[PDB]
mmCIF file of all heavy atoms in Angstrom:
data_model
loop_
_atom_site.group_PDB
_atom_site.id
_atom_site.type_symbol
_atom_site.label_atom_id
_atom_site.label_comp_id
_atom_site.label_asym_id
_atom_site.label_seq_id
_atom_site.Cartn_x
_atom_site.Cartn_y
_atom_site.Cartn_z
ATOM 1 N N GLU A 74 108.121 100.294 110.066
ATOM 2 C CA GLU A 74 106.823 100.182 109.359
ATOM 3 C C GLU A 74 105.850 99.791 110.445
ATOM 4 O O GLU A 74 106.293 99.103 111.427
ATOM 5 C CB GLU A 74 106.851 99.198 108.237
ATOM 6 C CG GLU A 74 107.439 99.712 106.890
ATOM 7 C CD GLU A 74 109.055 99.847 106.931
ATOM 8 O OE1 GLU A 74 109.682 99.543 107.931
ATOM 9 O OE2 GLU A 74 109.601 100.322 105.895
ATOM 10 N N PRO A 75 104.556 100.021 110.247
ATOM 11 C CA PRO A 75 103.475 99.593 111.216
ATOM 12 C C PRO A 75 103.598 98.130 111.522
ATOM 13 O O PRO A 75 103.491 97.724 112.737
ATOM 14 C CB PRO A 75 102.202 99.922 110.414
ATOM 15 C CG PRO A 75 102.579 101.031 109.550
ATOM 16 C CD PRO A 75 103.977 100.791 109.066
ATOM 17 N N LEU A 76 103.755 97.290 110.556
ATOM 18 C CA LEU A 76 103.924 95.851 110.745
ATOM 19 C C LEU A 76 105.267 95.358 110.187
ATOM 20 O O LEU A 76 105.912 95.905 109.421
ATOM 21 C CB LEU A 76 102.794 95.044 109.970
ATOM 22 C CG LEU A 76 101.364 95.513 110.148
ATOM 23 C CD1 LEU A 76 100.359 94.662 109.340
ATOM 24 C CD2 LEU A 76 100.970 95.475 111.596
ATOM 25 N N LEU A 77 105.693 94.226 110.882
ATOM 26 C CA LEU A 77 106.972 93.533 110.455
ATOM 27 C C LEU A 77 106.774 92.136 110.349
ATOM 28 O O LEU A 77 106.323 91.447 111.319
ATOM 29 C CB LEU A 77 108.001 93.795 111.585
ATOM 30 C CG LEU A 77 109.346 93.079 111.507
ATOM 31 C CD1 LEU A 77 110.111 93.478 110.324
ATOM 32 C CD2 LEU A 77 110.134 93.344 112.747
ATOM 33 N N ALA A 78 107.167 91.540 109.167
ATOM 34 C CA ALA A 78 107.090 90.132 108.933
ATOM 35 C C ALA A 78 108.504 89.491 108.852
ATOM 36 O O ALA A 78 109.317 89.869 107.951
ATOM 37 C CB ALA A 78 106.330 89.868 107.684
ATOM 38 N N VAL A 79 108.847 88.613 109.759
ATOM 39 C CA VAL A 79 110.185 87.954 109.903
ATOM 40 C C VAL A 79 109.919 86.527 109.243
ATOM 41 O O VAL A 79 109.084 85.808 109.855
ATOM 42 C CB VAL A 79 110.771 87.875 111.313
ATOM 43 C CG1 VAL A 79 112.061 87.279 111.276
ATOM 44 C CG2 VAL A 79 110.834 89.335 111.828
ATOM 45 N N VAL A 80 110.619 86.200 108.186
ATOM 46 C CA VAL A 80 110.469 84.927 107.581
ATOM 47 C C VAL A 80 111.768 84.038 107.598
ATOM 48 O O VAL A 80 112.712 84.486 106.934
ATOM 49 C CB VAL A 80 109.998 85.076 106.094
ATOM 50 C CG1 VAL A 80 109.618 83.731 105.540
ATOM 51 C CG2 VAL A 80 108.742 86.068 106.068
ATOM 52 N N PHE A 81 111.720 82.963 108.281
ATOM 53 C CA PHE A 81 112.804 82.031 108.162
ATOM 54 C C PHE A 81 112.718 81.174 106.958
ATOM 55 O O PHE A 81 111.643 80.682 106.701
ATOM 56 C CB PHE A 81 112.907 81.186 109.487
ATOM 57 C CG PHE A 81 113.285 81.898 110.641
ATOM 58 C CD1 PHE A 81 112.246 82.609 111.430
ATOM 59 C CD2 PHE A 81 114.622 82.048 111.044
ATOM 60 C CE1 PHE A 81 112.667 83.328 112.560
ATOM 61 C CE2 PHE A 81 115.004 82.730 112.200
ATOM 62 C CZ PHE A 81 114.033 83.436 112.909
ATOM 63 N N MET A 82 113.763 81.351 106.110
ATOM 64 C CA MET A 82 113.801 80.632 104.849
ATOM 65 C C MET A 82 115.125 80.166 104.473
ATOM 66 O O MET A 82 115.930 80.046 105.271
ATOM 67 C CB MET A 82 113.160 81.594 103.704
ATOM 68 C CG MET A 82 113.897 82.899 103.821
ATOM 69 S SD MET A 82 113.109 84.238 102.584
ATOM 70 C CE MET A 82 113.882 83.572 100.930
ATOM 71 N N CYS A 83 115.218 79.895 103.172
ATOM 72 C CA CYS A 83 116.550 79.409 102.665
ATOM 73 C C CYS A 83 116.490 79.488 101.023
ATOM 74 O O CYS A 83 115.449 79.912 100.534
ATOM 75 C CB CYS A 83 116.867 78.025 103.157
ATOM 76 S SG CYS A 83 115.635 76.715 102.723
ATOM 77 N N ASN A 84 117.526 78.981 100.426
ATOM 78 C CA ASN A 84 117.526 78.988 99.004
ATOM 79 C C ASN A 84 117.060 77.823 98.170
ATOM 80 O O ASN A 84 116.725 77.829 96.963
ATOM 81 C CB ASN A 84 118.902 79.289 98.484
ATOM 82 C CG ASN A 84 119.636 80.543 99.076
ATOM 83 O OD1 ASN A 84 118.933 81.456 99.516
ATOM 84 N ND2 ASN A 84 120.959 80.568 99.042
ATOM 85 N N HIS A 85 117.114 76.590 98.745
ATOM 86 C CA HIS A 85 116.743 75.403 97.992
ATOM 87 C C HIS A 85 115.413 74.664 98.350
ATOM 88 O O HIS A 85 114.963 73.793 97.577
ATOM 89 C CB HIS A 85 117.902 74.381 98.042
ATOM 90 C CG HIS A 85 118.010 73.612 99.360
ATOM 91 N ND1 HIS A 85 118.292 74.292 100.537
ATOM 92 C CD2 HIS A 85 117.857 72.334 99.634
ATOM 93 C CE1 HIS A 85 118.271 73.399 101.502
ATOM 94 N NE2 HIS A 85 118.070 72.217 100.994
ATOM 95 N N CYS A 86 114.819 74.984 99.529
ATOM 96 C CA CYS A 86 113.681 74.285 99.895
ATOM 97 C C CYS A 86 112.481 74.563 98.905
ATOM 98 O O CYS A 86 112.098 75.609 98.542
ATOM 99 C CB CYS A 86 113.175 74.818 101.284
ATOM 100 S SG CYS A 86 111.710 73.954 101.923
ATOM 101 N N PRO A 87 111.830 73.327 98.423
ATOM 102 C CA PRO A 87 110.725 73.528 97.506
ATOM 103 C C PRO A 87 109.599 74.313 98.060
ATOM 104 O O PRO A 87 108.809 75.009 97.333
ATOM 105 C CB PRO A 87 110.340 72.072 97.185
ATOM 106 C CG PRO A 87 110.717 71.337 98.409
ATOM 107 C CD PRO A 87 112.150 72.015 98.708
ATOM 108 N N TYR A 88 109.399 74.355 99.417
ATOM 109 C CA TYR A 88 108.390 75.095 100.054
ATOM 110 C C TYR A 88 108.595 76.558 99.994
ATOM 111 O O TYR A 88 107.634 77.450 99.927
ATOM 112 C CB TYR A 88 108.157 74.663 101.526
ATOM 113 C CG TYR A 88 107.719 73.244 101.582
ATOM 114 C CD1 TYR A 88 108.626 72.194 101.519
ATOM 115 C CD2 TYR A 88 106.345 72.918 101.749
ATOM 116 C CE1 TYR A 88 108.151 70.825 101.629
ATOM 117 C CE2 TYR A 88 105.875 71.580 101.842
ATOM 118 C CZ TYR A 88 106.841 70.575 101.776
ATOM 119 O OH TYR A 88 106.416 69.269 101.859
ATOM 120 N N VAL A 89 109.897 76.919 100.007
ATOM 121 C CA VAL A 89 110.269 78.367 99.883
ATOM 122 C C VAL A 89 110.294 78.804 98.377
ATOM 123 O O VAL A 89 109.750 79.814 98.025
ATOM 124 C CB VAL A 89 111.733 78.647 100.482
ATOM 125 C CG1 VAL A 89 112.192 80.081 100.168
ATOM 126 C CG2 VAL A 89 111.758 78.410 101.956
ATOM 127 N N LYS A 90 110.747 77.921 97.528
ATOM 128 C CA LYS A 90 110.767 78.196 96.153
ATOM 129 C C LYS A 90 109.318 78.370 95.508
ATOM 130 O O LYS A 90 109.211 79.208 94.640
ATOM 131 C CB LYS A 90 111.436 77.088 95.309
ATOM 132 C CG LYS A 90 112.992 76.986 95.414
ATOM 133 C CD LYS A 90 113.546 75.815 94.760
ATOM 134 C CE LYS A 90 115.081 75.748 94.701
ATOM 135 N NZ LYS A 90 115.613 74.614 93.897
ATOM 136 N N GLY A 91 108.440 77.656 96.061
ATOM 137 C CA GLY A 91 107.075 77.795 95.565
ATOM 138 C C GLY A 91 106.282 78.895 96.199
ATOM 139 O O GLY A 91 105.158 79.216 95.758
ATOM 140 N N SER A 92 106.776 79.501 97.275
ATOM 141 C CA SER A 92 106.086 80.633 97.968
ATOM 142 C C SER A 92 106.872 81.965 97.947
ATOM 143 O O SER A 92 106.320 82.953 98.392
ATOM 144 C CB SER A 92 105.785 80.205 99.422
ATOM 145 O OG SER A 92 106.956 79.983 100.173
ATOM 146 N N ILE A 93 108.056 81.877 97.543
ATOM 147 C CA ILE A 93 108.888 83.208 97.501
ATOM 148 C C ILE A 93 108.318 84.190 96.596
ATOM 149 O O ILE A 93 108.368 85.449 96.896
ATOM 150 C CB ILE A 93 110.417 82.905 97.254
ATOM 151 C CG1 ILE A 93 111.188 84.180 97.294
ATOM 152 C CG2 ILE A 93 110.544 82.339 95.717
ATOM 153 C CD1 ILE A 93 111.188 84.781 98.720
ATOM 154 N N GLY A 94 107.640 83.840 95.443
ATOM 155 C CA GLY A 94 106.988 84.693 94.615
ATOM 156 C C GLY A 94 105.958 85.472 95.299
ATOM 157 O O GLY A 94 105.850 86.726 95.187
ATOM 158 N N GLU A 95 105.178 84.756 96.085
ATOM 159 C CA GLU A 95 104.109 85.374 96.818
ATOM 160 C C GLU A 95 104.617 86.339 97.937
ATOM 161 O O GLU A 95 104.155 87.424 98.163
ATOM 162 C CB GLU A 95 103.199 84.266 97.446
ATOM 163 C CG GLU A 95 102.029 84.895 98.363
ATOM 164 C CD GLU A 95 100.985 83.805 98.784
ATOM 165 O OE1 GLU A 95 101.107 82.686 98.472
ATOM 166 O OE2 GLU A 95 100.070 84.249 99.576
ATOM 167 N N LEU A 96 105.630 85.829 98.648
ATOM 168 C CA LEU A 96 106.227 86.703 99.664
ATOM 169 C C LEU A 96 106.752 88.028 99.054
ATOM 170 O O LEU A 96 106.565 89.138 99.713
ATOM 171 C CB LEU A 96 107.396 85.900 100.357
ATOM 172 C CG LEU A 96 107.128 84.765 101.245
ATOM 173 C CD1 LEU A 96 108.344 84.076 101.778
ATOM 174 C CD2 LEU A 96 106.310 85.358 102.514
ATOM 175 N N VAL A 97 107.431 87.936 97.893
ATOM 176 C CA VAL A 97 107.965 89.185 97.305
ATOM 177 C C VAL A 97 106.782 90.063 96.854
ATOM 178 O O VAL A 97 106.863 91.341 97.003
ATOM 179 C CB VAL A 97 108.943 88.832 96.105
ATOM 180 C CG1 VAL A 97 109.227 90.079 95.323
ATOM 181 C CG2 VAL A 97 110.192 88.182 96.689
ATOM 182 N N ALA A 98 105.718 89.393 96.339
ATOM 183 C CA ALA A 98 104.520 90.174 95.945
ATOM 184 C C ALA A 98 103.906 90.891 96.982
ATOM 185 O O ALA A 98 103.434 91.966 96.854
ATOM 186 C CB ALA A 98 103.583 89.244 95.152
#
């Protein structure tokens, strides 16, 4: 794809839990 976004994350971090919705969107 023209752009590529690599995101370091995990399953339990509150910062990931609160932003995963936006990332998927």
Side-chain angles (χ1 to χ4, degrees):
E74 279 75 3
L76 309 182
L77 170 66
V79 181
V80 187
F81 287 88
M82 51 184 282
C83 60
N84 307 335
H85 77 297
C86 183
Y88 295 84
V89 173
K90 288 178 173 183
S92 66
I93 187 59
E95 177 169 0
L96 286 174
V97 170

